[PDB]
Amino acid sequence: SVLYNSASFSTFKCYGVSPTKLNDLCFTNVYADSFVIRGDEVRQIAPGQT
Amino acid sequence: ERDISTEIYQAGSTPCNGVEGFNCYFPLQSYGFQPTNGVGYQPYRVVVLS
Protein backbone atom coordinates (compact mmCIF):
# COMPACT_ATOMS: atom_id res chain seq x y z
CA SER A 1 0.00 0.00 0.00
CA VAL A 2 3.02 2.33 0.29
CA LEU A 3 3.99 1.69 -3.36
CA TYR A 4 1.41 3.66 -5.38
CA ASN A 5 -0.57 6.08 -3.18
CA SER A 6 2.11 8.76 -2.78
CA ALA A 7 3.15 8.68 -6.45
CA SER A 8 2.54 6.40 -9.41
CA PHE A 9 5.31 4.74 -11.41
CA SER A 10 5.78 3.66 -15.02
CA THR A 11 4.90 -0.03 -14.72
CA PHE A 12 3.99 -2.07 -11.64
CA LYS A 13 3.37 -5.79 -12.09
CA CYS A 14 4.17 -9.17 -10.57
CA TYR A 15 4.57 -12.69 -11.94
CA GLY A 16 2.97 -15.79 -10.44
CA VAL A 17 0.96 -13.79 -7.89
CA SER A 18 -1.27 -10.73 -7.92
CA PRO A 19 0.60 -7.62 -6.70
CA THR A 20 -2.53 -6.56 -4.81
CA LYS A 21 -2.12 -9.38 -2.26
CA LEU A 22 1.56 -8.88 -1.42
CA ASN A 23 0.44 -8.47 2.20
CA ASP A 24 -0.87 -12.00 2.81
CA LEU A 25 1.97 -13.79 1.01
CA CYS A 26 5.02 -14.55 3.14
CA PHE A 27 8.46 -14.70 1.51
CA THR A 28 11.95 -15.55 2.78
CA ASN A 29 15.39 -13.99 2.20
CA VAL A 30 14.24 -11.10 0.02
CA TYR A 31 16.91 -9.59 -2.24
CA ALA A 32 16.94 -6.09 -3.74
CA ASP A 33 18.48 -5.39 -7.16
CA SER A 34 18.28 -1.94 -8.74
CA PHE A 35 19.74 -0.13 -11.75
CA VAL A 36 18.97 2.54 -14.36
CA ILE A 37 18.30 2.01 -18.08
CA ARG A 38 16.80 3.85 -21.02
CA GLY A 39 13.02 3.98 -21.20
CA ASP A 40 13.14 2.32 -24.61
CA GLU A 41 15.07 -0.61 -23.09
CA VAL A 42 12.22 -1.22 -20.61
CA ARG A 43 10.63 -3.76 -22.97
CA GLN A 44 13.90 -5.73 -22.87
CA ILE A 45 13.44 -5.94 -19.07
CA ALA A 46 10.91 -8.78 -19.02
CA PRO A 47 10.89 -12.52 -18.23
CA GLY A 48 11.00 -13.91 -21.76
CA GLN A 49 12.52 -11.08 -23.79
CA THR A 50 16.04 -10.45 -25.07
CA GLU B 1 -21.86 -21.16 -14.36
CA ARG B 2 -21.31 -18.72 -17.22
CA ASP B 3 -20.70 -14.97 -17.23
CA ILE B 4 -21.00 -12.68 -20.26
CA SER B 5 -20.96 -9.08 -19.01
CA THR B 6 -17.61 -7.33 -19.44
CA GLU B 7 -16.56 -4.56 -17.05
CA ILE B 8 -13.21 -2.83 -16.65
CA TYR B 9 -11.41 -4.39 -13.69
CA GLN B 10 -10.16 -2.14 -10.89
CA ALA B 11 -6.97 -2.99 -8.99
CA GLY B 12 -6.97 -1.58 -5.46
CA SER B 13 -7.04 2.21 -5.25
CA THR B 14 -7.56 4.80 -8.03
CA PRO B 15 -11.21 4.18 -9.00
CA CYS B 16 -11.54 4.04 -12.78
CA ASN B 17 -15.15 5.00 -13.67
CA GLY B 18 -14.77 3.02 -16.90
CA VAL B 19 -11.62 4.63 -18.30
CA GLU B 20 -9.08 1.74 -18.19
CA GLY B 21 -6.16 3.77 -16.88
CA PHE B 22 -3.67 3.03 -14.11
CA ASN B 23 -4.61 -0.10 -12.13
CA CYS B 24 -7.53 -0.55 -14.56
CA TYR B 25 -7.54 -3.28 -17.20
CA PHE B 26 -9.92 -4.81 -19.71
CA PRO B 27 -11.42 -8.00 -18.21
CA LEU B 28 -10.66 -10.22 -21.21
CA GLN B 29 -7.44 -10.97 -23.07
CA SER B 30 -6.89 -12.58 -26.47
CA TYR B 31 -4.72 -15.50 -27.62
CA GLY B 32 -1.65 -15.98 -29.77
CA PHE B 33 -2.69 -19.21 -31.46
CA GLN B 34 -0.53 -20.21 -34.44
CA PRO B 35 0.69 -23.58 -35.76
CA THR B 36 4.27 -22.30 -35.47
CA ASN B 37 3.95 -22.15 -31.67
CA GLY B 38 4.93 -24.94 -29.31
CA VAL B 39 3.09 -28.23 -28.96
CA GLY B 40 1.68 -27.26 -25.58
CA TYR B 41 0.66 -23.85 -26.91
CA GLN B 42 -1.41 -25.43 -29.70
CA PRO B 43 -5.19 -25.03 -29.30
CA TYR B 44 -7.23 -28.06 -28.28
CA ARG B 45 -10.99 -28.37 -28.70
CA VAL B 46 -12.89 -29.71 -25.69
CA VAL B 47 -16.29 -31.44 -25.65
CA VAL B 48 -17.56 -32.07 -22.11
CA LEU B 49 -20.46 -34.49 -21.61
CA SER B 50 -22.58 -34.15 -18.47
Swiss-Prot record, chain B:
Subunit structure: Binds to host ACE2. RBD also interacts with the N-linked glycan on 'Asn-90' of ACE2. Cleavage of S generates a polybasic C-terminal sequence on S1 that binds to host Neuropilin-1 (NRP1) and Neuropilin-2 (NRP2) receptors. Interacts with host integrin alpha-5/beta-1 (ITGA5:ITGB1) and with ACE2 in complex with integrin alpha-5/beta-1 (ITGA5:ITGB1). May interact via cytoplasmic c-terminus with M protein. May interact (via N-terminus) with host bilirubin and biliverdin, thereby preventing antibody binding to the SARS-CoV-2 spike NTD via an allosteric mechanism.
Name of the featured protein: Spike protein S1
Effect on the protein upon substituting Q29R: In strain: Omicron/BA.1, Omicron/BA.2, Omicron/BA.2.12.1
Residues of the full protein shown: 465 to 514 of 1273
UniProt-reported outcome of changing V19A: Increased resistance to neutralizing antibodies
Effect of N37T: Reduced host ACE2-binding affinity in vitro
Protein function: Attaches the virion to the cell membrane by interacting with host receptor, initiating the infection. The major receptor is host ACE2. When S2/S2' has been cleaved, binding to the receptor triggers direct fusion at the cell membrane. When S2/S2' has not been cleaved, binding to the receptor results in internalization of the virus by endocytosis using host TFRC and GRM2 and leading to fusion of the virion membrane with the host endosomal membrane. Alternatively, may use NRP1/NRP2 and integrin as entry receptors.
Species this chain originates from: Severe acute respiratory syndrome coronavirus 2
Region described as Disordered: 1-26
Resulting phenotype, F22V: In strain: Omicron/BA.4, Omicron/BA.5, Omicron/BQ.1.1
Gene: S
Cysteine-cysteine disulfides: C16-C24
Domain of life, source organism: Viruses
Region annotation Receptor-binding motif: where it falls in the sequence: 1-44
